[PDB]
Design a protein around this ligand. Sequence first.
Ligand SMILES: CC[C@H](/C=C(/C)[C@@H]1C[C@@H](OC)C[C@H](O)C(C)(C)[C@@]2(O)O[C@@H](C[C@@H](OC)[C@H](O)C(=O)O1)C[C@@H](OC)[C@H]2O)CO
Ligand SMILES: C/C(=C\c1csc(C)n1)[C@@H]1C[C@@H]2O[C@@H]2CCC[C@H](C)[C@H](O)[C@@H](C)C(=O)C(C)(C)[C@@H](O)CC(=O)O1
Ligand SMILES: Nc1nc2c(ncn2[C@@H]2O[C@H](COP(=O)(O)OP(=O)(O)OP(=O)(O)O)[C@@H](O)[C@H]2O)c(=O)[nH]1
Ligand SMILES: Nc1nc2c(ncn2[C@@H]2O[C@H](COP(=O)(O)OP(=O)(O)O)[C@@H](O)[C@H]2O)c(=O)[nH]1
Ligand SMILES: [Ca+2]
Ligand SMILES: [Ca+2]
Ligand SMILES: [Ca+2]
Ligand SMILES: [Mg+2]
Ligand SMILES: [Mg+2]
Lengths: 54, 439, 428, 351
Amino acid sequence: MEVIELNKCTSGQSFEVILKPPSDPSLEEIQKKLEAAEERRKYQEAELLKHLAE
Amino acid sequence: MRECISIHVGQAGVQIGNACWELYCLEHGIQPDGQMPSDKTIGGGDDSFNTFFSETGAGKHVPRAVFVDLEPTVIDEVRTGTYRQLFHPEQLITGKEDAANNYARGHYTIGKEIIDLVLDRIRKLADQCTGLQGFLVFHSFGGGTGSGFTSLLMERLSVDYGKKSKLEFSIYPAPQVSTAVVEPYNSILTTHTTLEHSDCAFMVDNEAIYDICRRNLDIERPTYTNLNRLISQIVSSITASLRFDGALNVDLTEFQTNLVPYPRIHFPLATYAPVISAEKAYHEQLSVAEITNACFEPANQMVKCDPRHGKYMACCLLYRGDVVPKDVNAAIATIKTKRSIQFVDWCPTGFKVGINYQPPTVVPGGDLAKVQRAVCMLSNTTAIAEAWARLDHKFDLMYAKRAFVHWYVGEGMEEGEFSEAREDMAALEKDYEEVGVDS
Amino acid sequence: MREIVHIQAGQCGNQIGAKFWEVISDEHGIDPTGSYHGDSDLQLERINVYYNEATGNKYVPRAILVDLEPGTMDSVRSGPFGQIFRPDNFVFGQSGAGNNWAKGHYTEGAELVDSVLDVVRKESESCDCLQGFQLTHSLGGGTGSGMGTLLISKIREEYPDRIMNTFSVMPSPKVSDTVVEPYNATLSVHQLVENTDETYCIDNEALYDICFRTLKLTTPTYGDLNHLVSATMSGVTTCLRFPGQLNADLRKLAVNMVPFPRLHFFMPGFAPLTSRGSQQYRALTVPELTQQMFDSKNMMAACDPRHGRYLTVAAIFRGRMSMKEVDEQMLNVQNKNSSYFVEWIPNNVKTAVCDIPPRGLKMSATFIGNSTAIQELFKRISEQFTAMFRRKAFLHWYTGEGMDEMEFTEAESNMNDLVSEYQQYQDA
Amino acid sequence: MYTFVVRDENSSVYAEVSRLLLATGQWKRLRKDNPRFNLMLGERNRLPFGRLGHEPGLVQLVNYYRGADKLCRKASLVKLIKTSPELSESCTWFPESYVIYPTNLTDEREVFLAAYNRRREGREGNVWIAKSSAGAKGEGILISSEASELLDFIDEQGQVHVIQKYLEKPLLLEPGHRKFDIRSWVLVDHLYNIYLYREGVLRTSSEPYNSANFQDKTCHLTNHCIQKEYSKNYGRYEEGNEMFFEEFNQYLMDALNTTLENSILLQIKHIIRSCLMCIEPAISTKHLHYQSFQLFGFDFMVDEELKVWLIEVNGAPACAQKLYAELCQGIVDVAISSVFPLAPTSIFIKL
Ligand SMILES: CC[C@H](/C=C(/C)[C@@H]1C[C@@H](OC)C[C@H](O)C(C)(C)[C@@]2(O)O[C@@H](C[C@@H](OC)[C@H](O)C(=O)O1)C[C@@H](OC)[C@H]2O)CO
Ligand SMILES: C/C(=C\c1csc(C)n1)[C@@H]1C[C@@H]2O[C@@H]2CCC[C@H](C)[C@H](O)[C@@H](C)C(=O)C(C)(C)[C@@H](O)CC(=O)O1
Ligand SMILES: Nc1nc2c(ncn2[C@@H]2O[C@H](COP(=O)(O)OP(=O)(O)OP(=O)(O)O)[C@@H](O)[C@H]2O)c(=O)[nH]1
Ligand SMILES: Nc1nc2c(ncn2[C@@H]2O[C@H](COP(=O)(O)OP(=O)(O)O)[C@@H](O)[C@H]2O)c(=O)[nH]1
Ligand SMILES: [Ca+2]
Ligand SMILES: [Ca+2]
Ligand SMILES: [Ca+2]
Ligand SMILES: [Mg+2]
Ligand SMILES: [Mg+2]
């Protein structure tokens, strides 16, 4: 039941009680992904307009 | 003093944000006006509350916060509401049409068009920081914006602010208040892309809050308002250490250090007590031992799960009000003999305790009773993986038939992202299982 | 997601469309002159979805009225609220379409279609943020069926990223004008499967059966039939017209209701429906609304939902009631009859509540189901189509307009594919 | 009308329980993945406990206690007995046992060899057994006295084994000179009441006990499946090597003067109580969002001094043929109907 690191101030306090011891992707990559998805949307719309034109 | 910027994304993030900043103002004695009489330092200072509030030369205390939503109607209310003078327009960002409960629409289609403005407005707040420690991000899992745009935002933040910590407050979907069938999809998709970018995430299951409001506040059919006032109390308990003088969880890095040993396993279970109805006339005030024992009741948890069948990696007890260390130690000693509290072998069986003497503040006319002492326990237990299991099962049911999938592919997302996100989740359940179980 | 542009085409389209505007104008407190006269700001909060604002606090329906003959639209001007529509939004020809899909789609309609698109374009440009379009028409005639689907295709070309929604009245021998209705309907359904996001299947067979069996009306008129449609259209658009959390716009509704792009044909329903007459002032209850709205005999598409399963369901309750009771009632219907809801779409029933009840009612409920049993409707049309087509009967009305038999074979093939695709998920 | 799902077809007990439920007319059976159920008759492994108790408007119950496997796994049971502040090594009714991990994939090897220096020069019988956590249905056991014959037999298989002290002096049944194990069935309900079935069974050896023939373990570790195979004297006394309590009481009064009630069942009720109350706070569904009950199969071994010892606890047991109808009906009565009523006196003993 060891109490360690007791710290007190006017606002309150804190401490630790131990019961038992032990035993990334670049901005450009993001742009690439967003643009790829946009390109796929554009292609799908292009195919639709092509179908409608027929 | 090291500043914290709060980001509120989508309807759920914005509405919860409203509730939190209202409560913050009450706790620090800040008027809706923005004036803070008790603050004798005009136009600046290095006080603990300055971590969340900046100051103008006219004595207005301005929240270090950004509200973002892809449609305007929710943020519009902030603009025309009680605390409208608190924020200035640059902090409130709105689009024209929302993500329609579609992660792909929020992340790829609409997100691409608004991401640079959002980051710029964030950069402006950061520019006024002598020592920014990081960000607190509020969002739902199930919404198109809350899921899709948030994960995009988190990626860019890791790029623009590589050193800074990022904490999440996330709303886990629940059918009793859910607005979309595809929420499990959005939940898994956003968790996958956000995972490596978040240092510590506090999941709040709407089902748990809903049941707590019915059970303990006697509310027949809880509204978002009821839910958010309870949620903000939890959030306040968690962020109090950043807004007040103290020695525990004093910076965002400490949250990770104290609660997150393994990076991927960064989802602490929050448990709060007591929750007492403001309508009850004769109420008996619970002791330290009672509110502490209640922290180990599944009914009081923000996520319904059984910690008995899991392992603890860390445990933090955050008290507010009439509490002395002697009574906490007595309570913990008794509880340890009557509860199944097993830690992993490579961790000390212990508790980090923080006490703030100021009892919880409640919104006047709210549903919550003023109490003399309250506690929020933050424990990293493998039992919270139950929530991932539930979510992953719903995902599997729909995805096996490719139900609703065309909505996402139609926005430019590839079907493979579904599988890639699901596999990452399977690895996550596996990670928890290794840590929490022995063969 | 704000403005919706409404289009009504043909006799049925304009008649049901006129009633729709009468009903919702009354609900939003708009008088036949376009002036607001209500007692609540709930009425005006989302008024811009269906109405434009003119000068003098005038509200004008964002509605376009289309026909190939002037008769019905003359009636609309003369009828109640005739003055409310923008005069320039009346677009009409003189020749008619003689109950002929080809005439509506390829010949007569083709001449009129550009002027209609001009009006649509004029309305869309004035929109802060257009959600999409709604169209009222029948599938059995010529103008609503042929020109209606032509319009849908043209609109989709100019607005590929907007939602297209229809209220489509299905023909039935029980309420029939011509023998060629199955031809016109099969041809239209083929267009609908490709070019709409949501289609409410309003079956005149079901409406008639409801008027006869349920409401005890010996001789149901179009007036009776249209009152059912008018009430249902009000209920299904409630979430769009009033502040709410669920299905608050067309896209969110579609995302919640349509798991596969082709399976977007909805089975609507309304409650209460009660015959005379110890049941008009009687207090209605939440359990009574819930049980009726889910009853097979109450569906407005002549199919038996008990023979199929629900992919998705939207339910809207209106009036002042207990939300706790609504939840409990919706839960027990699902829990006591779980087999009728596919297990591979968890939580597929969604509930919305609006405080403002429809006129003459203290409370009501509107049902919207995406059921695999809807195949029975398309299967019925297919049989009637095939009975004539196998003998090439009445085909000359169509080939005389430049169509050939191959186009008929395709439409038949496509509708039969739709039927089997609904069957696939009924056993999945 | 109540609803349930079946997620374990291979269950003979709960196939009968299920058949019973349907025949009541007040129960409807659903698809295995329909989440809208009142009762789950779940699978034997990886039961999705985390998915239970999350259906609004539905009280849910499952026929297993989560965590009850700590009594039912051979290797976990030993661990629990030794390290419990309620059992500890203050357990006088469980044979000395050690957990042995193989030397390729913590372990009590120098606890099995360190405590072995006790009967080596101690001149006491050093007979040990070797059981698997999940053996090949009924095979994978090697009994020998050679200490170095067993510490390498476990490194011959691909799992963890437990070496348990063999009772060299088992109670003998006459006429036959045989060795038997006793099976008692226990039902624990949602309220965690312990219900022992009044009717237990005896798995008898159909061949005379042999202290010499060790490699032939067919009269040792009698299981009503292997026994039928090797036995060239299959049931000269009783059908299917099953002796029942009424009869075993008679043999006890004839050849041992005492009765079944006197002491043997006494030690049995104490054993069942001790194990289940030890695990109570960890597995109880007292204030959980779902409820649990479970049928247990405790296997006992008695000796010459009429002392009861504990072999294993079976988490998914099958019942004796003649008791199925009575026991399964009892399961429905106190475990299911007690949660889900309809519209005497029972066959159990509330421990
Ligand atoms: C759940 C979706 C739904 C499917 C079914 C089966 C639903 C369920 C329930 O209604 C919601 C039934 C309901 O609770 C009752 C029992 C009170 C009742 O009304 O059932 C009908 C017969 C029933 O079909 C058999 C009905 O026609 C029907 O459609 O029922 C007889 C009637 O005699 C007085 C009465 O006994 C289709 O949308
Ligand atoms: C008043 C009605 C139901 C009701 C009110 S109180 C109660 C117990 N039931 C519904 C109203 C629904 O809007 C739909 C009206 C449908 C009108 C009918 C098709 C038809 O025009 C009319 C002649 C009727 O049949 C009744 C007047 C009997 C109508 O009230 C039937 C009905 O259920 O209306
Ligand atoms: N606790 C709480 N949950 C909310 C609130 N608002 C929405 N939710 C939940 O959030 C999920 C829906 O996400 P939203 O935030 O509303 O959607 P969004 O982020 O605005 O994204 P889109 O509207 O699709 O563009 C559902 O599970 C709701 O139950 C709220 O104010 N409080
Ligand atoms: N419910 C309803 N159906 C109608 C109405 N008018 C016509 N119909 C149906 O619509 C089909 C005829 O199409 P119609 O609209 O009259 O031809 P169009 O003017 O060329 O579009 C037939 O199946 C009729 O039963 C009406 O007012 N209400
Ligand atoms: Ca200051
Ligand atoms: Ca002409
Ligand atoms: Ca032109
Ligand atoms: Mg939104
Ligand atoms: Mg006509």
